[PDB]
Amino acid sequence: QFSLRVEILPSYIPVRVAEKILFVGESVQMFEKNQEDTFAAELHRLKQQPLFSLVDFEQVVDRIRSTVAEHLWKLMVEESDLLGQLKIIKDFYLLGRGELFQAFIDTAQHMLKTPPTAVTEHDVNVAFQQSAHKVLLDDDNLLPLLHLTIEYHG
Amino acid sequence: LWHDKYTLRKSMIPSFMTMDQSRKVLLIGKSINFLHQVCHDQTENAFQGKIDAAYFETSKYLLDVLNKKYSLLDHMQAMRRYLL
Numbered sequence: 001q002f003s004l005r006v007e008i009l010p011s012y013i014p015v016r017v018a019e020k021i022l023f024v025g026e027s028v029q030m031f032e033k034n035q036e037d038t039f040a041a042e043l044h045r046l047k048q049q050p051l052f053s054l055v056d057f058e059q060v061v062d063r064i065r066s067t068v069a070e071h072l073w074k075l076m077v078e079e080s081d082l083l084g085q086l087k088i089i090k091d092f093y094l095l096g097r098g099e100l101f102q103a104f105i106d107t108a109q110h111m112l113k114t115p116p117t118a119v120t121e122h123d124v125n126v127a128f129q130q131s132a133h134k135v136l137l138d139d140d141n142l143l144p145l146l147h148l149t150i151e152y153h154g
Numbered sequence: 155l156w157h158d159k160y161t162l163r164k165s166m167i168p169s170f171m172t173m174d175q176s177r178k179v180l181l182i183g184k185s186i187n188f189l190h191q192v193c194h195d196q197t198e199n200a201f202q203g204k205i206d207a208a209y210f211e212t213s214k215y216l217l218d219v220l221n222k223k224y225s226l227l228d229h230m231q232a233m234r235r236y237l238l
Contacts, residue, residue, distance in 0.1 A: 055190050055191045056190075056196065059194075059196055
């Protein structure tokens with residue numbers, strides 16, 4: 001998790017490209033062919049220029065930016081399916097699968113009108129687990145990933 | 155980037171360039187300087203032929219990038235249908 005600096009940033013460099021730099025790099029450090037050497041020739045080329053031309057500094061950054069972004073979108077959607085994951089969030093977070101909750105509310109009702117204690121946190125995770133099976137939803141995937149929390153004592 | 159930042163210096167024009175030829179260089183320089191920054195794109199008698207050769211190519215290219223990448227004409231027609 002890196003950040004950006006402004007109190008040391010140059011003057012003639014705009015913050016817009018500064019943000020572009022901060023993203024194109026972190027998208028590599030986190031991520032742990034021909035798209036590698038050719039840009040090295042581009043950067044080296046600028047080192048030969050006897051005059052710093054911002055109008056050209058962006059035409060090399062933005063292409064590098066758009067290439068990694070195009071490469072990242074390929075993974076964030078196709079390989080790592082986002083649609084399936086968003087479909088999970090809409091169902092459970094946003095009450096998309098409301099039919100699961102009317103049963104969970106039907107069961108785990110008396111154990112919540114009382115003030116919360118140190119034991120109620122587990123008294124509901126089971127009831128929620130009794131619920132998913134009560135709606136014939138049988139999937140060991142994405143079932144243990146959902147853990148209800150009880151903000152107790154603060 | 156057209157109306158200002160470019161001035162024809164009446165004092166430092168060489169005698170061997172007619173006053174009209176000095177307005178075809180200030181227009182070819184401006185046409186390329188403006189093609190890079192704002193448009194966001196990167197690429198005697200024989201002397202008179204060089205100015206015109208650099209004119210009938212740069213300007214003809216400035217319209218192509220200004221009609222395909224921005225459709226300057228398609229806005230004039232659309233600005234008559236609605237605004238007029």
